[PDB]
Amino acid sequence: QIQLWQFLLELLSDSSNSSCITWEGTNGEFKMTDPDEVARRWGERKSKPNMNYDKLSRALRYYYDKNIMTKVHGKRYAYKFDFHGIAQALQP
Amino acid sequence: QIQLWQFLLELLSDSSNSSCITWEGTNGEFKMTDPDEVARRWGERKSKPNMNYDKLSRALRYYYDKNIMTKVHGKRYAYKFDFHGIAQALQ
Known about the structure:
- 2 copies of one chain form a homodimer.
- The first copy, chain A, is of the alpha+beta class.
- Helices cover 41% and strands 14% of the residues of chain A.
- Chain A has a 4-stranded antiparallel beta sheet with strand order 1-2-4-3.
- The first copy, chain A, is globular, with a radius of gyration of 12 Å.
- The PDB classes it as structural protein.
- Keywords: ETS transcription factor, Ergp55, structural protein.
């Protein structure tokens, strides 16, 4: 029942997934160093094997007005978690 | 009929298709510079619309454990042929 933003947090919290996703700095910004792999592993986790990057991207973009996550303007495959929103949600 | 991985080698062997697919380096890595066009052409050849990159990419994944072709991890549309397997499968 896990949601996408949590799964990314799960991957980032585990230093070993740096092969495909990694922290950038310390203020909640991250980079998908292997975007196709992030989409494939999110596919495994949610039992949806036609998961691909286009669909992963569409889901990430959906969060833009939901105090979850926004896409970083200068960079490719970069997002920044909404610090206040993620903090708030990660309690209930 | 012809199989997907063969059709890709066919496109790669012909210098004029670099607009959509091209060899990268000399160890069997290649890049699809226009993935949608590669898919469109694979669509006509196997007389199979509505072929698109998503169905194509998923088909390529079949090869990853069959000593034909593997997907290059840092990248989006770059793949690498298995020389030994390609050699053996051909004869």
